[PDB]
């Protein structure tokens, strides 16, 4: 399995646990989200950083647009 966590409609805590799960086998985890879930992706990354793995570093943040309608995307890479 890869190291990506797709942030969608589930409650923030579910993704916080999914990110912790990925961080058990990887030193890097990629959080991706689109549209209104972008703010939840940031909440998730901030929670990991603030409360669980305080030494965690944000290796990369990239924004873009996906698809007859455009939708904003964010990708946040967390690294130990």
């Amino acid at each position: 399995m890869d190291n990506v966590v797709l942030i969608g409609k589930k409650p923030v805590m579910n993704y916080v646990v999914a990110v912790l799960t990925q961080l058990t086998s990887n030193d890097e985890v990629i959080i991706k989200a689109r549209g209104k879930a972008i703010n939840k992706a940031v909440d998730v990354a901030e929670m990991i950083r603030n409360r669980f793995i305080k030494d965690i570093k944000i290796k990369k943040i990239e924004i873009g647009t996906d698809k007859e309608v455009n939708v904003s995307t964010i990708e946040i890479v967390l690294a130990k």
Side-chain angles (χ1 to χ4, degrees), residues 20-67 69-79:
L20 293 177
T21 294
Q22 293 274 25
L23 245 2
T24 71
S25 302
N26 304 105
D27 269 355
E28 285 179 39
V29 180
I30 303 165
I31 301 166
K32 298 190 180 172
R34 306 201 306 181
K36 180 183 275 71
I38 287 174
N39 59 280
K40 182 182 287 181
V42 175
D43 283 340
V44 172
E46 282 297 300
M47 287 198 49
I48 297 289
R49 183 192 209 176
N50 292 166
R51 304 153 196 160
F52 301 90
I53 315 174
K54 302 186 182 183
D55 63 288
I56 200 79
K57 304 78 178 300
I58 300 178
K59 182 186 173 196
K60 182 166 110 277
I61 297 180
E62 179 176 307
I63 57 181
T65 297
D66 275 358
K67 300 173 179 53
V69 196
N70 296 323
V71 61
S72 289
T73 62
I74 193 164
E75 180 172 299
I76 305 168
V77 179
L78 298 181

